[PDB]
Design a protein around this ligand. Structure first.
Ligand SMILES: *[C@@H]1O[C@H](CO)[C@@H](O)[C@H](O)[C@H]1NC(C)=O
Lengths: 245, 143, 65
């Protein structure tokens, strides 16, 4: 019922098991397709119906591979029909296909070279983000202060849509530092680090603005945020039903 | 010694220059001077050699800031920056949120050079201005 | 005389029926887009697809509430 569209070229799949396995602890039939090697095309529908109800797209430098497996129009068709999506795009792997899809959805990620730099931070090593920036209590409500880790992050701008669902936020002193001279993409708390989107058919997409988040090394800091993120992204955390009106 | 000037919308409104915080690289304070259409406020703050320099104007408690970048001149052995805020070119959601909620629009300044020792960079609220106008919501905000 | 260029496309309505002598024409309002974008942008995307702005530029939006 679930796909896993990874790319062994940039970030192998081995280092994404601690959460993937957890999915199989619950009821989740997982299928895998390494765009980097495979040449055939995936099959999303059975008889004008949905073969797969979830999708996952780990980091990928971009190219004809995922463009052929899942083009923008096919993604939008699979979304309009109730189907959940999870995307990630660090400043090293920004798949143009996913970027254009999101832009179609109001979420404007940052381009290749731009990286979120942020002084006044707990550790110089990486972008540690405090638990104070969480915005939605129906996605993950922090109990005690925790610090999430983003190695190479990438913010995103947002339109004012009723459908968009901010989840995290960048530190107020953080800016996107392009190597080439350009305007700073995001600046401060107007640049988002984790975003969600709920379709008008109650379908759900979630964009994580980094590749070092869902990894295995950072499990201890991120264990309790990532699980609830996946739950919400897969319509298993906050679903509402109306009866006998 | 940067002088940030909010030209005007109308009249002149006022400034509550409160800091009420710990000693985070404090230096001289802002001095206001109405001398032209632009009513300029001159401040002399420390760590005057930063790589990133911005002015955030808004309400941090609601995440509605706006970033302004200054223009640097090379007078020599000096540090002057002019932030030109136009009160009629400010984001709609900001004026309306300032009106709806009686919370002052705070203007914070950030200088940091990416390599200075921790606590050598400045993140201090150098101004806190207030307005009393007629902000209409018949075309309401996205907020 | 009418030429094909004189008539711009319809982005918000679908044609569901036209009589045999084109005397009565019945259109239907299409439901708002699921992704919550303007139907005009959907239209321009499907129609003028062969030539799109492949350059990346800050969209110059306003402050997110
Ligand atoms: C996939 O990546 C591997 C490197 O891990 C490489 O052997 C191969 O060239 C790539 N696939 C294609 C079709 O180039």
């Amino acid at each position: 019922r679930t796909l896993v569209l990874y790319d062994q070229s940039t970030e192998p799949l081995e280092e994404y098991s601690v959460y993937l396995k957890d999915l199989e602890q619950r009821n989740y039939k997982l299928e895998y397709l390494d765009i980097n090697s495979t040449s055939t095309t995936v099959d999303l529908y059975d008889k004008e119906q949905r073969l797969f109800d979830n999708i996952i797209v780990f980091p990928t430098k971009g190219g004809k591979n995922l463009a052929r497996q899942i083009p923008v129009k096919q993604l939008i068709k699979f979304f309009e029909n109730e189907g959940n999506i999870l995307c990630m795009s660090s400043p090293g792997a920004v798949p143009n296909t996913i970027r254009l899809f999101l832009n179609e959805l109001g979420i404007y990620p940052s381009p290749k070279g731009h990286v979120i730099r942020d002084y006044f931070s707990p550790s110089s090593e990486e972008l540690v983000v405090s638990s104070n920036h969480l915005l939605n209590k129906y996605v993950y409500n922090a109990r005690k202060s925790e610090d999430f880790v983003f190695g190479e992050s990438s913010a995103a701008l947002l339109e004012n849509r009723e459908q968009i669902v901010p989840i995290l936020n960048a530190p107020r002193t953080s800016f996107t530092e392009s190597k080439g001279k350009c305007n700073s993409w995001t600046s401060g708390s107007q640049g988002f680090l984790v975003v969600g989107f709920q379709n008008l058919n109650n379908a759900r997409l979630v964009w994580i603005g980094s590749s070092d988040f869902l990894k295995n090394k950072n499990q201890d800091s991120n264990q309790e945020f990532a699980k609830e993120l996946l739950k919400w992204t897969f319509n298993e955390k906050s679903v509402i039903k109306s009866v006998h009106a | 010694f940067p002088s940030t000037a909010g030209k005007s919308r109308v009249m002149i409104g006022k400034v509550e220059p409160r800091i009420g915080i710990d000693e985070t690289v404090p230096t001289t304070i802002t001095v206001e001077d109405p001398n032209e259409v632009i009513q300029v406020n001159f401040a002399i703050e420390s760590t005057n050699k930063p790589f990133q320099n911005t002015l955030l104007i808004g309400l941090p408690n609601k995440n509605l800031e706006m970033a302004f970048e200054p223009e640097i001149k090379d007078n020599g052995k000096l540090s002057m920056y002019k932030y030109r805020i136009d009160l009629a070119k400010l984001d709609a959601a900001l004026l309306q949120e300032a009106s709806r909620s009686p919370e002052p629009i705070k203007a914070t300044l950030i200088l940091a050079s990416s390599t200075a020792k921790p606590k050598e960079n400045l993140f201090r609220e150098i101004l806190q201005l207030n307005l009393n106008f007629d902000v209409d919501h018949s075309d309401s905000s996205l907020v | 005389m009418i030429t094909p260029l004189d008539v711009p496309p319809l982005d918000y309505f679908d044609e569901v029926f036209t009589s045999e002598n084109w005397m009565v024409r019945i259109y239907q309002l299409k439901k708002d887009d699921a992704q919550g974008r303007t139907l005009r942008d959907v239209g321009e995307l499907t129609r003028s697809s062969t030539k799109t702005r492949r350059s990346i530029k800050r969209p110059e939006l306003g402050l997110r509430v």
